[PDB]
Amino acid sequence: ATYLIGDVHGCYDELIALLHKVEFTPGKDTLWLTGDLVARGPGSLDVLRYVKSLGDSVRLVLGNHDLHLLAVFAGISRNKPKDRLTPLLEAPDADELLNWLRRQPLLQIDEEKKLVMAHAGITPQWDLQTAKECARDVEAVLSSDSYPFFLDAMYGDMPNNWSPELRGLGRLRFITNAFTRMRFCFPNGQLDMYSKESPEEAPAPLKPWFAIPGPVAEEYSIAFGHWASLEGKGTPEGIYALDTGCCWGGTLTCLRWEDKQYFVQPSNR
Ligand SMILES: [Mn+2]
Ligand SMILES: [Mn+2]
């Protein structure tokens, strides 16, 4: 069976309880995770240890909080007490866990399922070939010995409009924002980097990225997490918003792909 779970955010107990509910069995089953494995919840260390131990039984994409953790680890960004990352940062296997984390993908594709997953979704300005090339470019910088330089370069809100002509810092910044921060678009597909509200509460003319028809969404299903204020609701057919806000006091959601059956674990917070 194939299971897809939204943002875990250190909610180790809820993750394990949800996997027991579906009798997840590595070697018979595969787990997809939308990213944001860490921060806010109490168990980021246990979450990373477990997810790494799954090997080929898990398909992860990196989220914005995963990248922030890497930036803190690398001395690029300051640790926020609210993120509850110190046990992970001080763990004896921190290097092993975080060097594994920075090598994980930004994008997962299964052609037999016609299924695409990224943390925030796929911007309507990208076709599949472009999304794959952009994922490969940022994965390359994150997997390299010089990854702290990129992590520092990644911060920024512009450019917010994709072009194949983009180069350098702006190209990397856009790619990072599209895969890990995107929620709303202007009518032309350009990214808004400020509104984090639900679609009904957003100021005009902003619309959810998935409300603008794009080439990837026309041919593939897209699963994503990230957008907690969406509450996993209000999406079109073929769009699966899996982040139901577990670390916020909401729920952890698991979707089984074969029958599109949902399983939900209440937050312990
Ligand atoms: Mn999140
Ligand atoms: Mn996120």
mmCIF file of all heavy atoms in Angstrom, residues 218-252:
data_model
loop_
_atom_site.group_PDB
_atom_site.id
_atom_site.type_symbol
_atom_site.label_atom_id
_atom_site.label_comp_id
_atom_site.label_asym_id
_atom_site.label_seq_id
_atom_site.Cartn_x
_atom_site.Cartn_y
_atom_site.Cartn_z
ATOM 1 N N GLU A 218 -2.675 19.470 -14.911
ATOM 2 C CA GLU A 218 -3.572 18.940 -15.933
ATOM 3 C C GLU A 218 -3.333 17.460 -16.190
ATOM 4 O O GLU A 218 -4.242 16.757 -16.641
ATOM 5 C CB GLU A 218 -3.425 19.736 -17.231
ATOM 6 C CG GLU A 218 -3.932 21.167 -17.129
ATOM 7 C CD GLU A 218 -3.813 21.932 -18.437
ATOM 8 O OE1 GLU A 218 -3.351 21.339 -19.440
ATOM 9 O OE2 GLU A 218 -4.173 23.133 -18.458
ATOM 10 N N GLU A 219 -2.124 16.965 -15.918
ATOM 11 C CA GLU A 219 -1.779 15.588 -16.233
ATOM 12 C C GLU A 219 -1.515 14.724 -15.007
ATOM 13 O O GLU A 219 -1.636 13.496 -15.096
ATOM 14 C CB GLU A 219 -0.552 15.554 -17.150
ATOM 15 C CG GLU A 219 -0.051 14.169 -17.487
ATOM 16 C CD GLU A 219 1.176 14.204 -18.391
ATOM 17 O OE1 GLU A 219 1.652 15.319 -18.720
ATOM 18 O OE2 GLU A 219 1.673 13.115 -18.758
ATOM 19 N N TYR A 220 -1.157 15.324 -13.877
ATOM 20 C CA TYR A 220 -0.777 14.583 -12.683
ATOM 21 C C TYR A 220 -1.644 14.995 -11.505
ATOM 22 O O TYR A 220 -2.113 16.129 -11.423
ATOM 23 C CB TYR A 220 0.695 14.830 -12.303
ATOM 24 C CG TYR A 220 1.688 14.271 -13.284
ATOM 25 C CD1 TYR A 220 1.995 14.954 -14.460
ATOM 26 C CD2 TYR A 220 2.312 13.059 -13.048
ATOM 27 C CE1 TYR A 220 2.899 14.443 -15.350
ATOM 28 C CE2 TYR A 220 3.229 12.540 -13.942
ATOM 29 C CZ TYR A 220 3.502 13.235 -15.105
ATOM 30 O OH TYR A 220 4.414 12.717 -16.006
ATOM 31 N N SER A 221 -1.834 14.067 -10.569
ATOM 32 C CA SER A 221 -2.280 14.449 -9.234
ATOM 33 C C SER A 221 -1.115 15.086 -8.487
ATOM 34 O O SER A 221 0.039 14.725 -8.705
ATOM 35 C CB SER A 221 -2.770 13.231 -8.449
ATOM 36 O OG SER A 221 -3.902 12.628 -9.077
ATOM 37 N N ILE A 222 -1.419 16.054 -7.624
ATOM 38 C CA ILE A 222 -0.387 16.720 -6.824
ATOM 39 C C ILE A 222 -0.760 16.602 -5.360
ATOM 40 O O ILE A 222 -1.838 17.048 -4.955
ATOM 41 C CB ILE A 222 -0.206 18.198 -7.205
ATOM 42 C CG1 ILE A 222 0.170 18.315 -8.685
ATOM 43 C CG2 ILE A 222 0.930 18.812 -6.339
ATOM 44 C CD1 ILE A 222 0.081 19.756 -9.234
ATOM 45 N N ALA A 223 0.141 16.039 -4.564
ATOM 46 C CA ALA A 223 -0.002 16.003 -3.123
ATOM 47 C C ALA A 223 0.983 16.995 -2.525
ATOM 48 O O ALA A 223 2.111 17.127 -3.010
ATOM 49 C CB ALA A 223 0.276 14.598 -2.575
ATOM 50 N N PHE A 224 0.549 17.710 -1.490
ATOM 51 C CA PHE A 224 1.431 18.690 -0.862
ATOM 52 C C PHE A 224 1.031 18.863 0.597
ATOM 53 O O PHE A 224 -0.012 18.368 1.034
ATOM 54 C CB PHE A 224 1.404 20.025 -1.649
ATOM 55 C CG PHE A 224 0.099 20.790 -1.544
ATOM 56 C CD1 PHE A 224 0.033 21.963 -0.799
ATOM 57 C CD2 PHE A 224 -1.057 20.345 -2.185
ATOM 58 C CE1 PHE A 224 -1.153 22.679 -0.685
ATOM 59 C CE2 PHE A 224 -2.251 21.067 -2.081
ATOM 60 C CZ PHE A 224 -2.297 22.235 -1.329
ATOM 61 N N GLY A 225 1.861 19.591 1.353
ATOM 62 C CA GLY A 225 1.533 19.893 2.739
ATOM 63 C C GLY A 225 1.564 21.392 2.947
ATOM 64 O O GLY A 225 0.839 22.104 2.242
ATOM 65 N N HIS A 226 2.387 21.863 3.902
ATOM 66 C CA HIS A 226 2.743 23.275 4.079
ATOM 67 C C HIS A 226 1.656 24.239 4.542
ATOM 68 O O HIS A 226 1.854 25.004 5.493
ATOM 69 C CB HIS A 226 3.328 23.805 2.772
ATOM 70 C CG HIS A 226 3.813 25.223 2.858
ATOM 71 N ND1 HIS A 226 4.813 25.630 3.717
ATOM 72 C CD2 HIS A 226 3.484 26.310 2.121
ATOM 73 C CE1 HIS A 226 5.050 26.918 3.527
ATOM 74 N NE2 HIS A 226 4.260 27.351 2.560
ATOM 75 N N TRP A 227 0.549 24.283 3.808
ATOM 76 C CA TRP A 227 -0.467 25.332 3.953
ATOM 77 C C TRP A 227 -1.500 24.964 5.017
ATOM 78 O O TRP A 227 -2.624 24.549 4.731
ATOM 79 C CB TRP A 227 -1.092 25.590 2.591
ATOM 80 C CG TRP A 227 -1.941 26.816 2.445
ATOM 81 C CD1 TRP A 227 -2.441 27.610 3.444
ATOM 82 C CD2 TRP A 227 -2.430 27.354 1.214
ATOM 83 N NE1 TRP A 227 -3.211 28.611 2.897
ATOM 84 C CE2 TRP A 227 -3.212 28.481 1.532
ATOM 85 C CE3 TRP A 227 -2.269 27.000 -0.131
ATOM 86 C CZ2 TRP A 227 -3.833 29.249 0.562
ATOM 87 C CZ3 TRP A 227 -2.883 27.770 -1.102
ATOM 88 C CH2 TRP A 227 -3.657 28.889 -0.749
ATOM 89 N N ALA A 228 -1.111 25.170 6.279
ATOM 90 C CA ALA A 228 -1.946 24.704 7.390
ATOM 91 C C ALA A 228 -3.281 25.436 7.455
ATOM 92 O O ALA A 228 -4.302 24.826 7.793
ATOM 93 C CB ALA A 228 -1.190 24.833 8.718
ATOM 94 N N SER A 229 -3.311 26.718 7.088
ATOM 95 C CA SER A 229 -4.570 27.453 7.183
ATOM 96 C C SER A 229 -5.588 26.981 6.152
ATOM 97 O O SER A 229 -6.773 27.308 6.273
ATOM 98 C CB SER A 229 -4.322 28.957 7.036
ATOM 99 O OG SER A 229 -3.963 29.278 5.703
ATOM 100 N N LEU A 230 -5.158 26.213 5.151
ATOM 101 C CA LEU A 230 -6.082 25.596 4.210
ATOM 102 C C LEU A 230 -6.874 24.474 4.877
ATOM 103 O O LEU A 230 -7.964 24.112 4.411
ATOM 104 C CB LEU A 230 -5.294 25.077 3.002
ATOM 105 C CG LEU A 230 -5.946 24.628 1.705
ATOM 106 C CD1 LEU A 230 -6.668 25.804 1.032
ATOM 107 C CD2 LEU A 230 -4.864 24.066 0.802
ATOM 108 N N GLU A 231 -6.314 23.872 5.922
ATOM 109 C CA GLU A 231 -6.962 22.810 6.689
ATOM 110 C C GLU A 231 -7.304 21.607 5.816
ATOM 111 O O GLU A 231 -8.223 20.846 6.123
ATOM 112 C CB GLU A 231 -8.209 23.324 7.432
ATOM 113 C CG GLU A 231 -7.889 24.498 8.364
ATOM 114 C CD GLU A 231 -9.113 25.130 9.015
ATOM 115 O OE1 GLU A 231 -10.162 25.256 8.351
ATOM 116 O OE2 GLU A 231 -9.021 25.490 10.206
ATOM 117 N N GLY A 232 -6.538 21.407 4.748
ATOM 118 C CA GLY A 232 -6.765 20.292 3.846
ATOM 119 C C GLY A 232 -8.064 20.342 3.068
ATOM 120 O O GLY A 232 -8.459 19.329 2.471
ATOM 121 N N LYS A 233 -8.731 21.497 3.036
ATOM 122 C CA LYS A 233 -10.042 21.650 2.414
ATOM 123 C C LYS A 233 -9.962 22.565 1.200
ATOM 124 O O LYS A 233 -8.990 23.295 1.000
ATOM 125 C CB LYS A 233 -11.066 22.253 3.388
ATOM 126 C CG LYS A 233 -11.190 21.615 4.740
ATOM 127 C CD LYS A 233 -11.810 22.639 5.698
ATOM 128 C CE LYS A 233 -12.548 21.997 6.857
ATOM 129 N NZ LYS A 233 -11.871 22.257 8.169
ATOM 130 N N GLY A 234 -11.021 22.531 0.393
ATOM 131 C CA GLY A 234 -11.183 23.504 -0.668
ATOM 132 C C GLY A 234 -10.345 23.295 -1.905
ATOM 133 O O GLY A 234 -10.124 24.253 -2.651
ATOM 134 N N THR A 235 -9.865 22.081 -2.151
ATOM 135 C CA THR A 235 -9.022 21.828 -3.307
ATOM 136 C C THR A 235 -9.804 21.178 -4.436
ATOM 137 O O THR A 235 -10.809 20.496 -4.207
ATOM 138 C CB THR A 235 -7.847 20.924 -2.927
ATOM 139 O OG1 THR A 235 -8.352 19.667 -2.470
ATOM 140 C CG2 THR A 235 -7.034 21.575 -1.805
ATOM 141 N N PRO A 236 -9.341 21.352 -5.670
ATOM 142 C CA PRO A 236 -9.960 20.677 -6.821
ATOM 143 C C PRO A 236 -9.687 19.180 -6.807
ATOM 144 O O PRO A 236 -8.816 18.672 -6.098
ATOM 145 C CB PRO A 236 -9.271 21.310 -8.030
ATOM 146 C CG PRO A 236 -8.531 22.488 -7.517
ATOM 147 C CD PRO A 236 -8.258 22.258 -6.072
ATOM 148 N N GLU A 237 -10.430 18.473 -7.656
ATOM 149 C CA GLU A 237 -10.134 17.071 -7.919
ATOM 150 C C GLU A 237 -8.687 16.916 -8.370
ATOM 151 O O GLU A 237 -8.210 17.665 -9.224
ATOM 152 C CB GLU A 237 -11.074 16.536 -9.002
ATOM 153 C CG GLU A 237 -10.777 15.117 -9.433
ATOM 154 C CD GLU A 237 -11.130 14.109 -8.352
ATOM 155 O OE1 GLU A 237 -12.087 14.374 -7.591
ATOM 156 O OE2 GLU A 237 -10.452 13.056 -8.265
ATOM 157 N N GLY A 238 -7.986 15.949 -7.781
ATOM 158 C CA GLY A 238 -6.615 15.679 -8.169
ATOM 159 C C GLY A 238 -5.573 16.457 -7.394
ATOM 160 O O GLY A 238 -4.373 16.288 -7.659
ATOM 161 N N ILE A 239 -5.998 17.306 -6.464
ATOM 162 C CA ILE A 239 -5.113 18.101 -5.620
ATOM 163 C C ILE A 239 -5.356 17.670 -4.178
ATOM 164 O O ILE A 239 -6.499 17.697 -3.700
ATOM 165 C CB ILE A 239 -5.365 19.607 -5.801
ATOM 166 C CG1 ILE A 239 -5.137 20.032 -7.262
ATOM 167 C CG2 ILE A 239 -4.524 20.416 -4.789
ATOM 168 C CD1 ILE A 239 -3.680 19.984 -7.726
ATOM 169 N N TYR A 240 -4.291 17.248 -3.485
ATOM 170 C CA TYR A 240 -4.399 16.668 -2.149
ATOM 171 C C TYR A 240 -3.582 17.502 -1.168
ATOM 172 O O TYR A 240 -2.349 17.405 -1.135
ATOM 173 C CB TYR A 240 -3.942 15.210 -2.161
ATOM 174 C CG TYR A 240 -4.773 14.368 -3.105
ATOM 175 C CD1 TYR A 240 -4.410 14.223 -4.441
ATOM 176 C CD2 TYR A 240 -5.925 13.740 -2.660
ATOM 177 C CE1 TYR A 240 -5.191 13.459 -5.322
ATOM 178 C CE2 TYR A 240 -6.690 12.966 -3.514
ATOM 179 C CZ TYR A 240 -6.322 12.833 -4.833
ATOM 180 O OH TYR A 240 -7.119 12.072 -5.655
ATOM 181 N N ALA A 241 -4.279 18.310 -0.372
ATOM 182 C CA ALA A 241 -3.666 19.150 0.657
ATOM 183 C C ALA A 241 -3.650 18.369 1.967
ATOM 184 O O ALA A 241 -4.656 18.290 2.680
ATOM 185 C CB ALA A 241 -4.429 20.466 0.802
ATOM 186 N N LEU A 242 -2.494 17.821 2.308
ATOM 187 C CA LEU A 242 -2.402 16.884 3.418
ATOM 188 C C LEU A 242 -2.057 17.520 4.761
ATOM 189 O O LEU A 242 -2.110 16.823 5.780
ATOM 190 C CB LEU A 242 -1.360 15.807 3.095
ATOM 191 C CG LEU A 242 -1.707 14.993 1.853
ATOM 192 C CD1 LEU A 242 -0.529 14.083 1.482
ATOM 193 C CD2 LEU A 242 -2.972 14.180 2.086
ATOM 194 N N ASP A 243 -1.702 18.804 4.812
ATOM 195 C CA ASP A 243 -1.307 19.410 6.083
ATOM 196 C C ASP A 243 -2.545 19.884 6.833
ATOM 197 O O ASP A 243 -3.089 20.954 6.555
ATOM 198 C CB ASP A 243 -0.347 20.566 5.849
ATOM 199 C CG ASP A 243 0.108 21.216 7.145
ATOM 200 O OD1 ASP A 243 -0.122 20.653 8.240
ATOM 201 O OD2 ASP A 243 0.730 22.290 7.061
ATOM 202 N N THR A 244 -2.968 19.106 7.824
ATOM 203 C CA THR A 244 -4.106 19.464 8.657
ATOM 204 C C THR A 244 -3.674 19.958 10.039
ATOM 205 O O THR A 244 -4.455 19.911 10.996
ATOM 206 C CB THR A 244 -5.070 18.277 8.729
ATOM 207 O OG1 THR A 244 -4.351 17.064 8.987
ATOM 208 C CG2 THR A 244 -5.811 18.122 7.385
ATOM 209 N N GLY A 245 -2.447 20.455 10.150
ATOM 210 C CA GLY A 245 -2.030 21.244 11.295
ATOM 211 C C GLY A 245 -1.792 20.483 12.582
ATOM 212 O O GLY A 245 -2.134 20.983 13.661
ATOM 213 N N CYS A 246 -1.176 19.300 12.511
ATOM 214 C CA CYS A 246 -1.031 18.497 13.723
ATOM 215 C C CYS A 246 -0.323 19.276 14.831
ATOM 216 O O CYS A 246 -0.772 19.289 15.985
ATOM 217 C CB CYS A 246 -0.279 17.201 13.424
ATOM 218 S SG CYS A 246 -0.272 16.096 14.885
ATOM 219 N N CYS A 247 0.790 19.931 14.507
ATOM 220 C CA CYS A 247 1.546 20.623 15.547
ATOM 221 C C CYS A 247 0.798 21.824 16.105
ATOM 222 O O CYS A 247 1.191 22.342 17.155
ATOM 223 C CB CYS A 247 2.899 21.084 15.016
ATOM 224 S SG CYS A 247 2.799 22.393 13.800
ATOM 225 N N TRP A 248 -0.241 22.285 15.414
ATOM 226 C CA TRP A 248 -1.039 23.440 15.811
ATOM 227 C C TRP A 248 -2.224 23.059 16.679
ATOM 228 O O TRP A 248 -3.001 23.936 17.070
ATOM 229 C CB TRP A 248 -1.570 24.161 14.563
ATOM 230 C CG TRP A 248 -0.517 24.828 13.727
ATOM 231 C CD1 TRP A 248 -0.209 24.550 12.424
ATOM 232 C CD2 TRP A 248 0.341 25.906 14.122
ATOM 233 N NE1 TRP A 248 0.800 25.377 11.990
ATOM 234 C CE2 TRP A 248 1.157 26.218 13.012
ATOM 235 C CE3 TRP A 248 0.510 26.629 15.308
ATOM 236 C CZ2 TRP A 248 2.118 27.228 13.053
ATOM 237 C CZ3 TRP A 248 1.470 27.631 15.345
ATOM 238 C CH2 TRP A 248 2.258 27.922 14.223
ATOM 239 N N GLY A 249 -2.394 21.779 16.970
ATOM 240 C CA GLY A 249 -3.568 21.315 17.674
ATOM 241 C C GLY A 249 -4.635 20.773 16.755
ATOM 242 O O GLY A 249 -5.762 20.531 17.210
ATOM 243 N N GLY A 250 -4.326 20.612 15.466
ATOM 244 C CA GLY A 250 -5.242 20.022 14.519
ATOM 245 C C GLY A 250 -5.106 18.516 14.484
ATOM 246 O O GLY A 250 -5.252 17.846 15.510
ATOM 247 N N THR A 251 -4.829 17.966 13.304
ATOM 248 C CA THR A 251 -4.737 16.525 13.150
ATOM 249 C C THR A 251 -3.580 16.197 12.221
ATOM 250 O O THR A 251 -3.149 17.020 11.407
ATOM 251 C CB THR A 251 -6.034 15.930 12.573
ATOM 252 O OG1 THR A 251 -6.295 16.523 11.296
ATOM 253 C CG2 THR A 251 -7.235 16.217 13.492
ATOM 254 N N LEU A 252 -3.090 14.972 12.339
ATOM 255 C CA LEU A 252 -2.179 14.419 11.350
ATOM 256 C C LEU A 252 -2.990 13.553 10.400
ATOM 257 O O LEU A 252 -3.721 12.668 10.849
ATOM 258 C CB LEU A 252 -1.076 13.601 12.023
ATOM 259 C CG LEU A 252 0.081 13.216 11.102
ATOM 260 C CD1 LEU A 252 0.872 14.470 10.658
ATOM 261 C CD2 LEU A 252 0.979 12.251 11.853
#
